[PDB]
Structure 1
Amino acid sequence: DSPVLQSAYDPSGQYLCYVTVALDKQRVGVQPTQWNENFLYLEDSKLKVTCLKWVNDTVAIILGMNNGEIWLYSVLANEVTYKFTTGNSYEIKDIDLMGNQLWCIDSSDAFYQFDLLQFKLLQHFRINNCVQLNKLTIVPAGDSVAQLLVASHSISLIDIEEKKVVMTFPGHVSPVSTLQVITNEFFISGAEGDRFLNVYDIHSGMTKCVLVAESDIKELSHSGQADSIAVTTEDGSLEIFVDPLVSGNKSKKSSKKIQIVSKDGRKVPIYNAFINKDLLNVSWLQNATMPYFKNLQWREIPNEYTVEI
């Protein structure tokens, strides 16, 4: 099992920002993905982070913590720049930005808007029929701050100016874990504990395809045009679906399977890969905490691949 609690790749695959535990603190860190180690701890065990996301004009991380704050934290400088807050001490479960517009859900069902250029709160609101929340995503249609997608155990496409639910998809039997928009209309979703990804149209509510993998998933990464989606599975393998929006008619099996076996016969796990156009950034824990990488050529390797180290 992983001692990396949670990790996030930067866009265009250069730096992995990962938070692990180190004697009831939270060793956060940034690692280049071609030696960066002097990165911070927070104070005590009751201040652990809950979500994190990149922002690419400087480059920085946002850490949605559990005490009730968001921490805008630089990377070149080591200190935290700003501490966004709500008025409540409730646990932020997910954060997502779009340009300047930031949006964080709570654990007490609220929604908060923010902006990382004005550094203040905008709207502080809840809605009915969303009784838990653990994912949200602002949709890409340019500067479309409207029509965001919240997700917990069923997915609710909700407006920001009509301010109510406009469509409701069936989710899973578990709380959702991965929800990401891959086109201007399609979004992939998948809970934890189950091996089933389902992609949804945003305008019809019809489950177009179901992707399957040989295990339950941990994190997905799609390309820039939704033609390759690589998930990392809980048994430490990498499953890449090539061209997942064509027509083996309703439920696509996994195409590429990369797992990493060292030259003594010991399987090492893979967490949080990243696939842009024709590369693959496989990451794995060599020692107990310090991760290593590999830039694998993606489209030319065979259907299965035991990477030796």
Structure 2
Amino acid sequence: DSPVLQSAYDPSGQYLCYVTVALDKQRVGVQPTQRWNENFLYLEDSKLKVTCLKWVNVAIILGMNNGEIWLYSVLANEVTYKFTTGNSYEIKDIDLMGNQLWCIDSSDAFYQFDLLQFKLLQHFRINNCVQLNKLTIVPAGDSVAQLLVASHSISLIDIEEKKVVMTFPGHVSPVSTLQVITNEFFISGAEGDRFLNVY
């Protein structure tokens, strides 16, 4: 294993944000990849843990086990605002386009958020999705008309029609990465697997 629990480059690739455990408390730090920062956000609760980390174009969205989402400004070294869903289930994945923000809970519940308005727009659950370890929203135009979900297999869902569109045969193990390389071509990877499927 590695000390770094989770890490993520910024879209420009010039800064890397990483989380590590100090004693029993997780600390979040950012470093300049291109070239030291001694400042880390310290999670005051041992129970609290980061499940998801996402850069924003200049805050990083951190989903916790607690069931709430954290918008963190690196310079102020403080969390600007706290997105909290009604439930307490841990957030499993997070994705963004501009103001749009979509997250998933251990209850398999979808939620839509607006960064500008600071509001929960909608929440719903689609049948035939027992587990959901990955959320990815397809880059179509400037609006989110479809979303890709995978737990062990992969499923495509429509937001307005709120039902699945197409299902792919995924890996035996849980899906770990679900990036969309191009249009009609997205890569999939799973925990403890040597193989990546292009679908």
Q: Same fold (TM over 0.5)?
A: yes
Mapped contact 1:69–1:83 kept (Cα < 8 A): yes
CA offsets 1:45-68 (integer angstroms, 9 cap, x no match): 210110110001xx0100000111
Give the distance between the partners of 2:159 and 2:33, measured in 1 at CA: 37
User: SS of the residue aligned with 2:47?
Assistant: helix
CA offsets 1:193-218 (integer angstroms, 9 cap, x no match):
01000111xxxxxxxxxxxxxxxxxx
Whole-angstrom CA distance in 1 between matches of 2:127 and 2:8: 31
How far apart, in 2, do the equivalents of 1:187 and 1:99 lie?
Answer: 21
Q: TM-score, normalised by structure 2?
A: 0.98
Q: Deviations over 1:223-242 (max 9, x none)?
A: xxxxxxxxxxxxxxxxxxxx
Quote how far apart the aligned CAs of 1:43 are.
1.1
Q: CA RMSD in A?
A: 0.8
Is the 8 Å Cα contact of residues 138 and 147 (structure 1) preserved in structure 2?
Answer: yes
Shift of 1:77: 1.2
1:156-202 alpha-carbon deviations (Å, 9 max, x no partner): 100000110000000111010011001122100010101000111xx
Equivalences for residues 1-309 of structure 1 within 5 A: 1-34=1-34, 35-56=36-57, 59-200=58-199
Identity over aligned pairs, percent: 100
Q: 1:87, 1:50 → 2: CA distance?
A: 18
Contact 1:91 1:107 in 2 (8 A): yes
Give the alignment's TM-score, normalised by structure 1: 0.63
Q: 2-side partners of 1:71 and 1:144: how far apart? A: 23
Per-residue deviation at 1:144?
3.0
Q: CA deviation at 1:142?
A: 2.1
- Match of 1:76, SS state, is coil
Residues 212-269 of structure 1 show CA distances to partners (whole Å, capped at 9, x for unaligned) of: xxxxxxxxxxxxxxxxxxxxxxxxxxxxxxxxxxxxxxxxxxxxxxxxxxxxxxxxxx
In the alignment, is the contact (CA less than 8 A) between 1:30 and 1:37 conserved in 2? no
Secondary structure of the 1:196 match is coil
State the Cα deviation string for residues 84-125 of structure 1 (Å, max 9, x = none).
010111110111011110000111110000011000001110
Q: How many residues align?
A: 198
Distance (Å, rounded) in 1 between the aligned partners of 2:33 and 2:130: 39
Cα deviation for residue 75 of structure 1 reads 1.0
Between the aligned partners of 1:164 and 1:90, the Cα distance in structure 2 is 22
| Counterpart Cα distance in 1 of 2:177 and 2:66 | 23
CA contact (8 A) 1:154 1:172 kept: yes
Superposition deviation, residue 151 in structure 1: 1.1
> How far, CA to CA, are the matches of 1:60 and 1:108 in structure 2?
27
Within 1, Cα distance between the matches of 2:196 and 2:152?
Answer: 14
Q: Structure 1 unaligned runs (5+)?
A: 201-309
Q: Work out the CA distance in 2 between the residues paired with 1:176 and 1:97.
A: 19
Moved over 3 A (4+): none
CA distance in 1, matches of 2:11, 2:76: 20
| 3-state SS of 1:38 partner | coil
Aligned residues of 1:31 and 1:37 also touching (Cα < 8 A): no
What stretches of structure 2 of length at least 5 have no aligned partner? none
> Within 1, Cα distance between the matches of 2:10 and 2:147?
22
Secondary structure of the residue that 1:194 maps to in structure 2?
coil
